[PDB]
Amino acid sequence: RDLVGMPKIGLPPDYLGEDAEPEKKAFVKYCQEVVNDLIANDRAGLIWPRFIDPETKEDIFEFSLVSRQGAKAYDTGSIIDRYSKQIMMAFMSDVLAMGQSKYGSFSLADSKTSLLAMSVDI
């Protein structure tokens, strides 16, 4: 659900409908294919109608990419990493993440038995 950059097309309400003139309905159909087929290939581009309404001093048609004005509060990436280490800590299986060291060993008779290796002994 990260819809930032999603293409948004704003049309006057007259265009959107069933009783609209065939020319208008054809325009809406083309916009549907434009939405459904637009990619970032070599021949990417747009020829859109542009009419700044003398009233309200704003354009009626726009093709714009939806934008967000904030950032997610919590960093999910570091959050999950903390719990993964905690889970491995509960089973004392840090060797899965850290890996085999040069001062740890799985040999029971060795003088440097790993914590996990001793657990299987119990």
Binding site: I87, M89, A90, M92, L115, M118, D121, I122
Partner: protein, 106 residues
């Protein structure tokens, strides 16, 4: 003679040493389960139990008189009877290891 007394709390039979209501035996049990739920606490009190339940035990006569036949046969009888229990010595250590969660085990 004991002219004084090591009177700890003696409130109503229950030991009222801990001034916090939560950590007293009627509710200390729950509190300990709740804290046992936590990962760090669980692993920290699990490693100690681990270490205790790792070593084995074998009866031994005192520093002197270790060559006496009576002491040797007594040690043998003690070890055999330790193995003669219907619950193994390791099982007894397991039952004791509630030691960490509460501080005492009857």
């Amino acid at each position: 003679g004991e002219v004084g007394s090591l009177g700890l709390k003696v409130r109503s039979g229950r030991i009222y040493e801990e001034p916090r209501q939560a950590l007293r035996f009627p509710e200390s049990i729950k509190t300990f389960q709740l804290m046992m739920r936590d990962p760090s606490v669980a692993a920290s009190v699990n490693i100690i139990k681990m270490f205790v339940r790792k070593v084995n035990w074998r009866f031994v006569p005192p520093k002197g008189k270790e060559k006496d036949a009576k002491m040797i046969e007594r040690a043998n009888f003690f070890n055999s009877l330790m193995n003669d229990m219907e619950h193994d010595w390791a099982d007894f250590i397991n039952s004791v290891m509630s030691f960490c969660t509460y501080g005492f085990c009857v």
